Symmetry: C4
Subunit: 459 residues, 4 copies
């Protein structure tokens, strides 16, 4: 039993010397790195083109349908008078009706197909307002039933004006929306020698009055549905490569599962020979757990990628996350091979022995960090653009700790020095104390912990 246990923990070179068995797993892992990386690169190159097509079409729609729109104004684009709102709505509808003769793109109309469109209707112009709304600020009185009523006007696309009678219920208006769909063909595909696919853009223009604040923001959003074109005509490798990736990962998974099973069996035998828990876990190869996880992630992502490229699936985000995480894991796995050489193993072991104390110090530091997050959010959120939400506060503080965006953070508060002196003084104390504590003490202690770990490894 002792000889088998000694062989189990041998290095790959020692194992080969002892038994001369073929190191299939190592070469398989190298091939897996190569093929997984190539697949990720090809997938990303393909996806960037579709992203660009959708973005360009959406920008063109913003320039076509939003009255007075200019680049960079998305966050502040809003109406402020009744005539401005009416003009924006009518301009959007008129541009929709004039699209064939003015657009640089080639778009087809879509009619019907369920709500909010009636049969034969291409554009839906809907206003949503409270069922009953009486607002008398002069008497400080109001009587509102907050049930939302929707009233829609249906516009049919022109054959190649009732909507002008729209009357908005301003005092009880919740929002106005314009919905329509446009079909186009993505000719850009021919650059990559692909067959062009057929896009349906669902366009929603929102005039939002939920704040009831006298300012109505205006936005345009699109959702793209992609299909194979019914009759494509332009005067294999990808699917085969995906199959190769799947087979490689399946073989790797089988071999790693076999190794883990043998490890478990040897662990049980050794435990029996002795007639704790960490001693048992010493038999587990964490690198093989990592490889099995990467194999599962890659197989799932590749199946999803095959589905997406056939236009049967649209879950780009999940596929990308699976493939990217698996690629990260397989690239991290390379460190195992470096661990077999002493000069690299010393550094890897330095990090490994440092990690526990670093995590304990993180436990100590996290409570202070959270206290600062909450305090900053409650006090500075009303006045500081970077403190509006807790996640934003955490991002700001984390960036400050690493010496980024500090002066602008200080400068945003200079406007309130005369307005609210107490708030400005508190912000001074808060920012200075936080930055000093975290940069000059916490980071120094992280450096000291790593240095001590290195010293103990080297001696």
């Amino acid at each position: 039993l002792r000889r088998r246990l000694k062989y189990f923990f041998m290095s790959p070179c020692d194992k080969f010397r002892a038994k001369g068995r073929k190191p299939c797993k190592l070469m398989l892992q190298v091939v897996k790195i190569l093929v997984v990386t190539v697949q990720l690169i090809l997938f990303g190159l393909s996806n960037q083109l579709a992203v660009t097509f959708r973005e360009e079409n959406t920008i063109a729609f913003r320039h076509l349908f939003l009255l007075g729109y200019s680049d960079g104004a998305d966050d502040t684009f809003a109406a402020y008078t009744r005539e401005q709102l009416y003009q924006a709505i009518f301009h959007a509808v008129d541009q929709y009706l004039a699209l064939p003769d003015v657009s640089l793109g080639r778009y087809a109309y879509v009619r019907g197909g369920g709500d909010p469109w009636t049969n034969g209707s291409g554009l839906a112009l809907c206003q949503r307002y409270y069922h009953r709304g009486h607002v008398d600020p002069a008497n400080d009185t109001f009587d509102i039933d907050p049930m939302v009523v929707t009233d829609c006007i249906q516009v049919d696309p022109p054959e190649r004006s009732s909507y002008k009678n729209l009357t908005l219920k301003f005092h009880k208006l919740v929002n106005v929306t314009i919905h329509f769909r446009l079909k186009t063909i993505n000719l850009q595909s021919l650059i990559n020698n692909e067959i062009p696919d057929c896009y349906t853009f669902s366009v929603l223009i929102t005039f939002d009055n939920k704040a009831h604040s006298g300012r109505i923001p205006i936005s345009l959003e699109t959702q793209a549905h992609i299909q194979e074109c019914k009759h494509p005509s332009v005067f294999s490798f990808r699917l085969l490569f995906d199959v190769v990736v799947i087979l490689t990962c399946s073989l790797s998974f089988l071999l790693c599962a076999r190794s883990l099973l043998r490890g478990f069996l040897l662990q049980n035998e050794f435990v029996g020979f002795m007639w704790s828990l960490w001693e048992r876990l010493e038999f587990v190869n964490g690198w093989y757990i990592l490889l099995v996880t990467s194999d599962v992630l890659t197989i799932s992502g590749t199946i999803m990628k095959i589905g997406i490229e056939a236009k049967n699936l649209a879950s780009y985000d999940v596929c990308s996350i699976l493939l990217g995480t698996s690629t990260l894991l397989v690239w991290v796995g390379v460190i195992r091979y470096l661990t077999f050489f002493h000069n690299y193993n010393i550094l890897i072991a330095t990090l490994r022995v440092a990690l526990p104390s670093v995590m304990r110090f993180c436990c100590c530091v996290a409570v202070i960090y959270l206290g600062y997050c909450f305090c900053g959010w409650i006090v500075l959120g009303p006045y500081h653009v970077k403190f509006r939400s807790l996640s934003m506060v955490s991002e700001c503080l984390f960036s400050l700790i690493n010496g980024d965006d500090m002066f602008v953070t200080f400068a945003a508060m200079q406007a309130q020095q005369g307005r609210s002196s107490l708030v400005w003084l508190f912000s001074q104390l808060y920012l200075y104390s936080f930055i000093s504590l975290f940069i000059y003490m916490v980071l120094s202690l992280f450096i000291a912990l790593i240095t001590g770990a290195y010293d103990t490894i080297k001696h």
Copy 2:
């Protein structure tokens, strides 16, 4: 006496083993953390909505009343000709008179109510100028009595033009102001299921000629007064939770005060048994001082929060500071529980033993920092936007020390290289010497001090 003293300094686990008393204080502190954090989160979520409502209304007012206003121009918005100023004033008044038929919001006029409005007056247009002003730059002569005279024109809101005869005394003009109030109802409250409240915005538009420089900046400011609406009609938990918070903190305060009293009594007995000062202070639990302070802050802030939510108080800033500081303190207090475990206590003790030498080094560094602040303010303030005031200078230098906003600081001075060579050379010397000294020596010494403290703790 020795047994009681030994029991006094026992850890909570040791205390429980020795006497098996109920650890009410510990569970109470955990509950306090939870409830205080929840209260802060709810208060912040409620306050953000009101902040947003006020901000949106103010932006809408800027777009409605300021001629030619656009987003982002607040700092530079100004008039430069007499006709520009007249047009801006008249546009503001005309928009005030036309508000009912053009605004997307629903506003009611307010009349009278004291100065600067007469009875029945909705808008006050006042010009302030020197009592006697004679300015003859051709003869380098002037005769001014700097007493300020105010002349106001009162405009009544329309029933649902004397102000056009305004004649500005340009050569002696101090400023022009437009004051008016608008009442509205905050319907947005219905999103959070709250009852809408009644807002009165006090709007002040200032055309400022204090510099007498040929450039007159124009600004709009608002102050919001919030009341319960007299007759609200929409087709408990908060107050009870605030009461629960107050009771929890009162119980914690009583227990901590009892512990501190027992500590004082034991200290007196021990001193008597011996028939210095720090030896006496060794009997004081600093964590309990922190807990008592947090309890007091939280109780005060919760009372103010109850007052504010009933529209009897408007001191949002003080309440927010109290609650945020108390939350920070209670979250910091968690470190006491970590001190009871050796592996975390080593790190906490490292920071504690480092602190004194760090403070002494800060004493050494502060005088150099202040000298640089004064020198930079006096020399570069005329030329550099980031050196206008001493607080701004301190913010700039502190950001530079942490590697932020450095290149822009250097680049601002590139314009003066040809204008004033001496100033540019001095700025080069100043910035390079400051940054090098503070980054490559001071920060390195902070790191060295922390490392030495860690080494001495570990050995």
Copy 3:
């Protein structure tokens, strides 16, 4: 043989004491530093002027020929309607025809000279479209032969309108281009007392429809061909200095080659006397390899500079790279002289002994870095402007590691929090984990390695 070997490894001072030979090489290296730096400075000063001339002319062309152009809009300048595109094209051609009477510069027309211009034609207006294109998004049908057909209209410059009949094939349009050349004389040369040279600017205006997305970007580019003017008349040192530089570097190269040859001969003799590889390499003077490389680079760059200044060559980039790299190398070579003094040699030796472990740690860190690069590119590239390409991803991550541009990176993802919650959560995990791992562990270990190297050198 032992005495000769001892003399070979002696320091320059020891060598001079032993034999009193003239230290020609050292003084030659000092002179080389001086002359090479002076040559680089003069070359850069001369090149900046031509760069500025070309840039100013190009900006003027953008203002002259691009309808509605303004500074800062280069990246977003685009057309969105058919009439916008027609107006832009016609405006460019009309401005070309009106240039003599409106331009502030002095330009001459160029006719003929090969494609795309016919004989006597000054301007070429060409549209490129697919040979056969039928696109029916209504039926999800298309029939395209992607062979590109070019149709050009030739405009002759006016004597000191068929192009108005242009009909664009919008549905199959690939792009539109406008080509023309303008000749000018660079009078600015007189500032530096140089003789003005004759420029020919080749101007290309592109209206790009490759994306077929409804948005057509518009760009203007120039290529400058510089010649000696045929008959210049304005009412030596450079060539001589270049010759001096070449001679200095040739002498240095000869001396260094002699030293390397003697080193090789002594190495062979010592090997023979012993009747490994690194032992042999110990005889090689790396500083002399550096000096020989710098001499070769400088001689090549100086020949190219002579050719360029005579208008016989236009390879500015290669010449600049050669001269700059050689200057960097010669300035780096100064460290050799510092190595001869103990107090500087300790620091140099600290860096030298640290380098190997630093490189091994870089091997360990690079795989993690690459995994993060790939994962970030695939997942965040669709949503984040800084993750579009792999090189951009590497730049972003490298900047994040050094505490730059962090908050903006976090803020770019705040828009997708509501759109795609999964992507936003993944981005949070990705960014936080990457930054924490690389700043708080990797950089700390680099510091620890350098500190250990310094400690071992000092003891």
Copy 4:
């Protein structure tokens, strides 16, 4: 002699115990710190107001006289067509003539007074062009005599149009300038209770054609001459405080000079008693050299400040530099008092013993830094806005070393990836290698040197 030498090197407390002499110098230094800081603060507060007045007047002039000017366009404001240039010139002159009826400021005209104005002329409009200029780019021919001829038109201010016949020699034009003077009174002074002073603004508008590039930049500059108004009338402390400062610094200078003289005499006696150089220098009190320098600088700056405040001097820059440097020095001098306490002296001595090795390492690092500066300037200057000049290159590299403005530096080169692949690859290599070398090795070694100095001091 031994007792006197021992007393000489005693600390102030030891000196007082030994002889009980009055420590006048110490209290005098404290008073000096106080009064010098107060003087600097008052001077800076006074200077900021004048700076603001001049800046506001200049901005108003830009809005008044520059056709189509808007804030933020100073760097790019330029003309591109002949009609644009004519319109800008005529608009400036017409606004000058209409100033009394349109300006919000109160300005008086200035006539005559030497060149460029004739007697009775308020505005001078001058074009400068080459004496002989023939430019024929069609034939690649030119004949230029570069002697500059100036032709001026004189406009008299209106009494409360020949300039319209201006014909510009475009092909030989060097520049166009408009010169005029405006007198105003600074009423803003009344805010600080000062007596208003009389300003004369000299306004120069330049249309610059030196590049001959088809783009003519337009700029406006002002120079302010300040006088006491002849007959001021508005319905001491500063001079007395300046005198007090001068007396305090004179007394401090006398005492420090006496101490230095006694040190020199004791050094000579000790040298004589022994019947090297650094041993002699050990007798010199560097803090007293610093105090003497600060006294001299403060006295000079205070005399200049007195002159300036009386309107007899206008050298604000030199006065500010003197006073700021003296304030910095006096604040730095406080460290001497901290050196007398052991716990602060250990840190001060750590920095002192670290300084030499840090300077030697700086010698080693500077040559590499300079090589990189030259290489980057020559190679990337044509393409990168941050590499235009050597000082700008140094600022950029220094900021990069400290982790600032890194991603934007990388991003500026992304445009040239397709244009010039070789340059982009070189920029990648250059930036990555520089940043890595300087952050991961050089800064780490600075940290190691400081840590070693601290360790040797502590042991």
